[PDB]
Amino acid sequence: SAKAISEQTGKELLYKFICTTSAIQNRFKYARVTPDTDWARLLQDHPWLLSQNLVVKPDQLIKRRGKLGLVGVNLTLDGVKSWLKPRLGQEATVGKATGFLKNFLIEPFVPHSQAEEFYVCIYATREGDYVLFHHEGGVDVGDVDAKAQKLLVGVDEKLNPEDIKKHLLVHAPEDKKEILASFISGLFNFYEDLYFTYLEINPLVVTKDGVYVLDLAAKVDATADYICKVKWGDIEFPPPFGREAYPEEAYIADLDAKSGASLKLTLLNPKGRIWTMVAGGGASVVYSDTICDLGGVNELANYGEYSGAPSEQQTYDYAKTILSLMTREKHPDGKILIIGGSIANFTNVAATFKGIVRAIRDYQGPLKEHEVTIFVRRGGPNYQEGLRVMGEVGKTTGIPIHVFGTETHMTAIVGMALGHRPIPGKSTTLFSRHTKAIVWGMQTRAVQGMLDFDYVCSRDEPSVAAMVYPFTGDHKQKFYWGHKEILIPVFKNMADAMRKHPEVDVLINFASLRSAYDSTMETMNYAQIRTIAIIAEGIPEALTRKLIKKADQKGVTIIGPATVGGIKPGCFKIGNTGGMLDNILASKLYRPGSVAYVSRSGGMSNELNNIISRTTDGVYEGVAIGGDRYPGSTFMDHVLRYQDTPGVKMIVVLGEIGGTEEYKICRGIKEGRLTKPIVCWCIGTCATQASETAVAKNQALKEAGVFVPRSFDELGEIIQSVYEDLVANGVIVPAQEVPPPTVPMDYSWARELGLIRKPASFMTSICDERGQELIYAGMPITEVFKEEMGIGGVLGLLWFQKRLPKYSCQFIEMCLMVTADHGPAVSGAHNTIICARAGKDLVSSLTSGLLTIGDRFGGALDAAAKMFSKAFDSGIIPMEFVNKMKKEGKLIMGIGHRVKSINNPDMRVQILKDYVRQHFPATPLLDYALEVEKITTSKKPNLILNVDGLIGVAFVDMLRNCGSFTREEADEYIDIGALNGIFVLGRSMGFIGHYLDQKRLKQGLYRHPWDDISYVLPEHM
Amino acid sequence: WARELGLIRKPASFMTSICDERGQELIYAGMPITEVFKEEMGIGGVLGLLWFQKRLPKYSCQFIEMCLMVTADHGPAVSGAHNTIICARAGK
Ligand SMILES: CC(=O)SCCNC(=O)CCNC(=O)[C@H](O)C(C)(C)COP(=O)(O)OP(=O)(O)OC[C@H]1O[C@@H](n2cnc3c(N)ncnc32)[C@H](O)[C@@H]1OP(=O)(O)O
Ligand SMILES: O=C([O-])CC(=O)C(=O)O
Ligand SMILES: O=C([O-])CC(=O)C(=O)O
């Protein structure tokens, strides 16, 4: 896609990046004035505006300004100011377009004679680049193809300056020959290294001082940005000069760029009654052409798309925008909405119609008020359910909605809505049944579709032999062969895939637009690969021309780029062409037919399969050559291939506007090379070079002898008529219909539309990973951070599933910090240190001590909480608990230090006791426990409440008396084991810190002293 | 029900090739447990079947058993046995 740029941007790029021995004058001498900006700042930032004479021109992509006189030449400052007074900022027109005039380019005027001027133009064609030059200056340059000098330079070819001198400068004046040679060489290099498509400099003032550029136009390959974004800087593409964009049109435009979907909307008549909301660019072209041809040319409101599987929000917004625009002004003859569409490849029709029905139900008021009628036609996955829900809402909201499926032709509904009809060495055999393909990329969906097509076509071997993915190791992917499981090898290099599968002759390159070129070259370096199908869309045209050249030299057939692929029923299917097996079975694409079709875009291919299946025997072969304007295989290269094929009996061709291609078919049939019946119809009339239009092409085909219909509506009718023309003579014999093998429904597909149940295990309630944001209990992660709850808060949410009050969260944090570490001598830290000094990883190392926890190391927390609980809630007063446990011969857990005591407090029990006292509401078990410690510290004085005990009791008392748990919940948590989770968590920090330490100290393997073992082995066993 | 009569497909993960619990008998490689015991292959034989998926010759099975016996223990001072003793001595 070559986009025209503002002449200022081309001027700047020429100034920065030209390279020639001669000197270019007036470098960085230009200015731009808009009605939105004043003059003083521009009059001061460029100090050369008061040095010489100036010339001003409209810099808004306006052609042939010299004949129409929209340029002010040889005028000084106030002269151009007074010239701009009646022009700068209001409605102006040129040719047919009317619109606001926004930009002016101002250039220091160069004194030039009429003989010093020159004409140059470099434009890219399919086979190379044309450079064109005339020496007789001015506008009067005469015919350029005979008197001016042309030069075709090939692709990947270097321009010799001697060739420029010998072939281009034959009639140029001798004085300026040597400077123009270098200038043209530099201009060609500048053209070639910035991927320009069109570069026309007119006129070119070459005086004795040097070279002067005054006016030029440039169209640049917008797809090559990834190569030259650093070179073009901040490139800008101006819209064609015309009327202002409506608020709703700009709304849709900005709503398109936010996603990966294709959303288009352009108004033709804002007060019209026929509105099209159709999926597929070719589909919109077809509906627009049919309505314009069927008398709705003066009433068709707009054209546009919603494609690329738009989201439900995108579809809702697009539908409400398009419906609000038809409810502004009403119409005496009613109003029509046409929700058309091509046959969907894989997108579920039901979901799109759910979005559309939601929008229609929300906008039904004005729609009923304005007396609108909705015609909906669609096909693809689960189109029946979508039509059912559309009819259900048509009966519900009262808006008359007429729903149709694949059985009806595309543009019948627009014939029904308007009331015109009543409303009810290149080879010829690319693919054989022994064909195998290598798929380049992780495209498991496409490969599975190919395998399903192979199985339903009764093939004996899969058509995918191996997959190449450079970003992973060599392994095997598990795929389906009907019911069976098969393993398709995935390789990292192309080389080993090629060697292990020497009989593979097709490569389907699923690479991106910036990786298809080199991959395709590397594939061409293997002689066994006879055809390459390039699916990527957006490869720059120069790289595509290099691909075409190398394919021609190596005899490889390229299908693409920017193609969906080609489908040969019963034999082969490239990637995703045809769609899922619902479309393949609906269009009877599992058995060969006798009609071969060649299309340009991939959106019309599915409709062509539908039409050919429902009107004739069926499709024998169908190839979409791609939407790029340098396709790897033209129409001719495939029509000759079909002519050489004895299997086919008639050929359908569907081209578009632009490109002298079907004239080659005309020359072929008048030459007599093509004899089989050819039906064709070039879509894209849109007449609302003169030979490039679809109407002229259709004519030339009609008088050439090709059965061209008057519109698309009778395309199926004319192919049917050719079908009787060929079966009456007895050359086409309809084959007997054999039922195809059936594949089971996919589980994911059968659950998406919900005809099946599977019970789900792993009930979970602490995190919801899916959706827009992480949800811990019921509050999203953003609300977790905005409410400023810390780690204690997320333990509340994840462990107890409750938004705990602030003091309990801070207490959880506190008891994590006191638990964090207690030295390396203890058993768990010992295990972590031993495993960390044995070369093991953090997980192993720390989890070793993690395991070590539980009973004797680590289990006093719970042991006390569960003891003191059963002591408080059973009535025993503090001193009958001290005495019951003596008698039971057990010790109280939670009571007992070794060195600390009355007078030497524990200092970690004092920080935490003082928070549990100052901040907690009621602490009834910390009181019972601090009374059992009066009875026990009377005995020995070091029998105080240990940190274990305190944390235990204070957590039982925050769980029970805080306000969120209900004393059964708060007693499940104590039993399930949630106090062994606090200890564990705390130790985990310390444990890791003893891994990270013994790893910084680089300590080695620990062999235990043997003097500290005392082997007690038996005598002789 | 829909899979019993086979109108649906679900991809199965967890390819396994060392044991078949389902069916009449346990099958280690392809050789049932009764054949495992009738051919008198020992623990080395079932390492051959489960680990390498092959019915190893008799000397290979006996050598695997031998190298398991020599590896069995090397005292309590070494690091791993130290960790096992520490964790066993903590009541786990
Ligand atoms: C110059 C000279 O020295 S000559 C002086 C001559 N006199 C002496 O020699 C007297 C010196 N000895 C003593 O007085 C001492 O009492 C001793 C050494 C006999 C024993 O004293 P203690 O260490 O207090 O006894 P013990 O170790 O059994 O502990 C006392 C209590 O702590 C309790 N206790 C210990 N740990 C815990 C625990 N974790 N939870 C609850 N209770 C506990 C025990 O149940 C015991 O209870 P009891 O008194 O009801 O049986
Ligand atoms: O088949 C494709 O690649 C295109 C597709 O799914 C869709 O958007 O309908
Ligand atoms: O917490 C435990 O049960 C063990 C411990 O840290 C200590 O040695 O005091």
UniProtKB/Swiss-Prot annotation, chain A:
Which EC numbers characterise this protein's activity in its record? 2.3.3.8
Give a yes or no for keyword Protein biosynthesis in this entry. no
For the ligand (CoA), the binding residues are L701, K702, E703, A704, G705, V706, F707, V708, P709, R710, S711
Q: Which residues bind ATP?
A: K57, R65, G66, P108, V110, E117, D215
Q: What are the Phosphothreonine sites (modified residues) in this protein?
A: T577
Q: Where does Mg(2+) bind?
A: D256, S259, A261
Q: Does the keyword Hydrolase apply?
A: no
Q: Record's Gene3D superfamilies?
A: 3.30.470.110, Cytochrome P450-Terp, domain 2, NAD(P)-binding Rossmann-like Domain, Succinyl-CoA synthetase domains
Q: Where in the cell is it found?
A: Cytoplasm, Cytosol
The alphabetized list of GO BP terms reads:
acetyl-CoA biosynthetic process; cholesterol biosynthetic process; citrate metabolic process; coenzyme A metabolic process; fatty acid biosynthetic process; lipid biosynthetic process; negative regulation of ferroptosis; oxaloacetate metabolic process
PTM annotation (Phosphotyrosine): residues: Y130, Y620
Q: Show the disulfide pairing.
A: none
The primary site where this protein sits is: cytoplasm
Q: Which residues form the ATP-grasp domain?
A: 3-264
N6-acetyllysine PTM positions read K478, K484, K492, K870, K890, K900, K999
Keywords from the UniProt entry: Acetylation, ATP-binding, Cytoplasm, Isopeptide bond, Lipid biosynthesis, Lipid metabolism, Magnesium, Metal-binding, Nucleotide-binding, Phosphoprotein, Transferase, Ubl conjugation
The UniProt GO MF terms for this protein read:
ATP binding; ATP citrate synthase activity; metal ion binding
User: Which enzyme type, at the first EC level?
Assistant: transferase
What mutagenesis or variant effect is reported for K484 to R/Q? Decreased acetylation and increased de novo lipid synthesis. Abolished ubiquitination by the BCR(KLHL25) complex
What post-translational events are described? Phosphorylated by PKA and GSK3 in a sequential manner; phosphorylation results in activation of its activity.
Q: Which residues carry this modification: Phosphoserine?
A: S262, S601, S761
Give the sites of the cross-link named Glycyl lysine isopeptide (Lys-Gly) (interchain with G-Cter in ubiquitin): K478, K484, K492
Q: Which cofactor does it need?
A: Mg(2+)
Question: Which PANTHER family does this one have?
Answer: ATP-CITRATE SYNTHASE
Subunit arrangement?
Homotetramer.
Q: What is the name of this protein? A: ATP-citrate synthase
Q: Which organism is it from?
A: Homo sapiens
Upper lineage is:
Eukaryota, Metazoa, Chordata, Craniata, Vertebrata
